[PDB]
Design a protein around this ligand. Sequence first.
Ligand SMILES: Cc1cc2nc3c(=O)[nH]c(=O)nc-3n(C[C@H](O)[C@H](O)[C@H](O)COP(=O)(O)OP(=O)(O)OC[C@H]3O[C@@H](n4cnc5c(N)ncnc54)[C@H](O)[C@@H]3O)c2cc1C
Ligand SMILES: Cc1cc2nc3c(=O)[nH]c(=O)nc-3n(C[C@H](O)[C@H](O)[C@H](O)COP(=O)(O)OP(=O)(O)OC[C@H]3O[C@@H](n4cnc5c(N)ncnc54)[C@H](O)[C@@H]3O)c2cc1C
Lengths: 684, 684
Amino acid sequence: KIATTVGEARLSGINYRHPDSALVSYPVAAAAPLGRLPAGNYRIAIVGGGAGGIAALYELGRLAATLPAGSGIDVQIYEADPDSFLHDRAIKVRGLKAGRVSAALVHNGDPASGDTIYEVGAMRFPEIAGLTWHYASAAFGDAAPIKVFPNPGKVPTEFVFGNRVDRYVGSDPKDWEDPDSPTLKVLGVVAGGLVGNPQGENVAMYPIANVDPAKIAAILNAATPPADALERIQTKYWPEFIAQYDGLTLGAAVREIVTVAFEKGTLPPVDGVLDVDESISYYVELFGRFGFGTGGFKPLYNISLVEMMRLILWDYSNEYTLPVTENVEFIRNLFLKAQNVGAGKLVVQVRQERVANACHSGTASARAQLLSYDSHNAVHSEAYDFVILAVPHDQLTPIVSRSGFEHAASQNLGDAGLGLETHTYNQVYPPLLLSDSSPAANARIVTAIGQLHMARSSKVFATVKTAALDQPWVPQWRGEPIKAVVSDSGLAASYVVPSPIVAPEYSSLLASYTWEDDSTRLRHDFGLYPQNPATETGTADGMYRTMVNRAYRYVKYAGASNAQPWWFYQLLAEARTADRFVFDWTTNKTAGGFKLDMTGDHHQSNLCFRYHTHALAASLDNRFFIASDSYSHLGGWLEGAFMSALNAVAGLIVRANRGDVSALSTEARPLVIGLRPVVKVPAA
Amino acid sequence: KIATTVGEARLSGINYRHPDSALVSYPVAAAAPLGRLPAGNYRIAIVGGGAGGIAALYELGRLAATLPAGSGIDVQIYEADPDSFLHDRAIKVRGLKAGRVSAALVHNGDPASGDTIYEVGAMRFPEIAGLTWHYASAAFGDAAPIKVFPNPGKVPTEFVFGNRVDRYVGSDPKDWEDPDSPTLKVLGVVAGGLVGNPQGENVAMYPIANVDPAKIAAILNAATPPADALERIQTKYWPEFIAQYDGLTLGAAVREIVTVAFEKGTLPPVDGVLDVDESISYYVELFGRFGFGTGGFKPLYNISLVEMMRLILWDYSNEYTLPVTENVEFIRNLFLKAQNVGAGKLVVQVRQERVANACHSGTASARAQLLSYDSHNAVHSEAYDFVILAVPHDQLTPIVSRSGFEHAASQNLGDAGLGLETHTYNQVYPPLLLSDSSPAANARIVTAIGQLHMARSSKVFATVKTAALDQPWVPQWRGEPIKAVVSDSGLAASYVVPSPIVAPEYSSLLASYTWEDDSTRLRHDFGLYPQNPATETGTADGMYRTMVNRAYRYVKYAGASNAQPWWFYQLLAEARTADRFVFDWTTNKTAGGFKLDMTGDHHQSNLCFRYHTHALAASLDNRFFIASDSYSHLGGWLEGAFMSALNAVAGLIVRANRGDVSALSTEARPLVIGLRPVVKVPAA
Ligand SMILES: Cc1cc2nc3c(=O)[nH]c(=O)nc-3n(C[C@H](O)[C@H](O)[C@H](O)COP(=O)(O)OP(=O)(O)OC[C@H]3O[C@@H](n4cnc5c(N)ncnc54)[C@H](O)[C@@H]3O)c2cc1C
Ligand SMILES: Cc1cc2nc3c(=O)[nH]c(=O)nc-3n(C[C@H](O)[C@H](O)[C@H](O)COP(=O)(O)OP(=O)(O)OC[C@H]3O[C@@H](n4cnc5c(N)ncnc54)[C@H](O)[C@@H]3O)c2cc1C
């Protein structure tokens, strides 16, 4: 039942269909090349060399290999990040980034003999992330081993909220230090209320198709679901869940569930002195700090219930590591495999340039324009047949929003406010061209992108000897030291992760992984932005001491009368002086870590998710596709970036075939036709 | 009916009662000293010299003057900010701060002869902010002149969202360049749906007491309403509104309103390419950028409807300036007045120290302990009879949350993780002491404080010659230049405010005032944090050019053949190079600008609002009060800081009288007894 290889994870999730694309398993669609292109020699640009852009590249290689003699695809990949792996063909980061897949290598002067790795971005991958594991198999093979990520509850964990302390492993009470814990009670209440039961009675508060989510998850994951079941989910039942609940936050939902349980007596008054509302609030906040298996979701309480429900259906917390020293190896290997699978019909060149503007212009064959700046701030303009914009929403905004919403006789585009050189384009149309005649349609896509919510996030890391965990001052529970700490100290979630360079002498002390307001509260103490140290040889000692100081709290435990400073203070202070670190995604050019939808945001994110369906309108000469987790219903996951890349390439095939969906494979067609179109066109 | 003096504004709002405190008009309660203290020589500390701490000092001065011969009050005021006015007897900030009332003086070498002032924090004051105007009268007199703040719609304004442009003053279509504007139409729909009508048919979507909110506002603002009507609001109808709608975001409410209006045909299809959901979404987002009179509330869409409704009942957008060069003068004058009114019976000493910890300890008469560090990190400990903690919630957390939740025999408190010296306290209880028996009650207040939401905010400023507004490319409305711009450019809201140091030669170009995600999106470009320039002599030129660059967009105006770069780019570029500035409240030690409650947060903030009622529990003997806009239902307003100060001193008087509320004036008593008590047991 635990997956032990890439192939086992891949096979586990191969059928799973997400509710906003319920007609299609993306892994099934991706089993063969997505479609066919007319003969020709294509000039394509990919803006961004992260997971989205590289998966797009790989699918373009699969397509290229199918082209006849004399045909081919040329791809220019634009990648502005100087630390990208694409430009590399104490704490080191150079060459160890693929966007938000980002490693920091801790070493003593020889990077080939390092101590540990900090996974600064992506680090844990759901078992049923079928497209993720599909690409991991391309990158590593099915035989490559994987491990269970040491999430709270997967390893012995300490939880602290207010006066409550718990030590536990799992959800079986036998393995909680307090089997009567209120934390375990509230967790069961909120799980019953949100997830419900896969068999028998329906007990969940927010049904889908009148039944518990657990039952719908099993349909969505079935190899061969009943006839019409996926269509009815896609067109009726999931839309009706959205209509009902997209205006309800996660935090509001938690409070509704707790309120009913408190009224029923499942959750008792917290002590004899708290009033009703106080007890209810206590339980909401207690559950908020505890979470669903990856730490407290209190900071995520403003997300739509719809967003949480996507994660529930997907069983998101059951996660694994990759068969790597650094997660960037996945994206690097996928980039290499893209070129291999092209069979010499795909040519790729990397540009170390920042794209500033996209548009359609002129009357030549290649009308999709990109304006960029190189490392010396010199301007470059290039025209393409098709472009895939593989950057998240805040980075996309300046590229697509500054050219207006209709034809312009001429525009002098570029970063004029920076004093950089502009380029005159003539007969200009916006890049995200939904209409030849409606500025509002063109404005809807741009304004949607610009108002998506990028969740704030930060990670504080240090290096510690793994043997520190064996000290008598580190609690043991069920035979192992505590290695995960979820707390209301300001640190939020902390992990002591064994080094993957190897038991290893060293561990990565992920002292704090924060989201949203938890991250905001820390940010004044980071010192340098987005990274401290900014240099390879420095150490963020001052910053880290502010984190240790947040752990300098007197914590009362049931096992001792005289409360003492929290043991975790001591553990954080056991980290070595060198190689103390923070990265703040919020002050990175991404303007945060990843998209999470607020109430109402579905209307914006789903427009982005469906945008590639513009290809159905043959009379609309739109050459631009988008590919990022920002344009998915899995912001915060490689799976979302990969799904958006698949959408982008499917749309590109349809556009290249001048609206003919038959150019898509049987299994890939639903990537376009299973969604509500963004342009109205005739039936069939 | 435009107010022209402090007294006119003061009288306008003198009766207004907020819905969470509907039994009392705070201005009326503040008219006379709040109560009486027993004879004694009191030792009090106020932590924080912002609006809350200084209003609290003022009220202590008024109390002190009532004490008999031989009695008095000594106050130690702790103020950590080196730039505080308390420690002072090119861009200058030294001496020009009173917490989040913060001015920057732009000058050329002689600060007595400056060019303009940037109001970095508070700047605009609702007419019906009665407590605000009550203290302004104490500081400046009723005769002092006031001006209308030049809000969007108060002065000629350009609004840009997507493809839509408007130029307007107010809400009368005769004063809009396009009287048929969809923007003005959606404003009428959303305002009608949220506020409704004061007379006639109820048209609002979310009634209070089964009627439109406008009708309730007229009762809350009445001189003599039926007492029974106020009590029913306080105990039944406002609580019922909260029960229903605390789980509904503003954004969700706007969508509900727009959906019903669309279905009714009140709002037409957005051009007849856009389908139903696209039209509704367009309108929701258009309204989002337009706002309620102070710019778009899109970034505020996650607030609870309850929070928005507080602002709707208060008519918050109708705002004025103060009779000052710099807003800090208000707070300074209130500090001087406190000392004047104390009539020799108040002695005040300022300490330039950061409080690190508070607790109750020991067995002496003074048990309210404060542990602090001076500007060279030397430790200090002092005990007091009473303490007012006048700091916002993220600054309060480390002071009150690291001592546990119950009696402890001994603790070594302080900032040990920073390497700073600790102090041993014996027989220690938490400072926010709600129970002698409940650690959960002590934990509830601490945990609530720590999880309040501090809204993020930033202001980008530059200095511009006022005459730039006369350039031929600056649009006019009836001959007056546009002086406010509300846009989806990333800048959010922009103002060209005449210098108060004087038609003035210069203006303060508030290039961008952002909240929440709008601020997050900019933050990577600020360069230095919290302030660029960090020095008196620098300029934030690179940062500011990134803001000019956001304005470099092709904007199409109706009737024009083609788009040209937006004129507002040209205006921003006219600012001089020197004295370009950003302040990021988010990276200040406040960890943001001001509290705004999310869905579910009422129960957290309201616990804080009611905390001073602990004074009713006589034997508890808790000596700590809290005083900040974080502990109010008006986060983001001086009104909230002032209300919380009034609550704190009212509570202190009852505590000083061992629980006897008869020691409050008749008019002040409801400040304590008109709220639900925070301690159920013991009663009182
Ligand atoms: C803190 C954090 C935690 C996460 N945890 C997980 C996890 O455990 N598991 C998981 O599956 N996912 C996780 N994710 C999400 C995962 O990292 C992302 O979904 C994925 O990496 C995003 O890929 P992308 O292609 O959409 O965008 P990005 O990774 O942002 O890549 C975009 C690329 O475009 C480049 N670029 C941007 N603008 C320009 C421009 N104008 N011109 C040229 N180049 C440009 C960038 O430099 C970058 O390399 C996490 C991410 C973060 C930050
Ligand atoms: C961007 C922005 C815009 C605003 N706009 C308006 C507006 O137009 N109108 C309006 O009415 N209000 C506005 N406000 C709100 C108004 O500024 C606040 O409500 C009010 O100033 C807060 O006062 P306070 O006493 O609660 O806290 P603060 O002003 O935060 O004062 C707390 C004081 O305590 C000190 N301190 C903190 N921690 C310690 C410690 N540990 N030891 C010692 N000293 C400490 C601080 O240095 C500070 O001086 C705005 C605020 C901001 C930031």
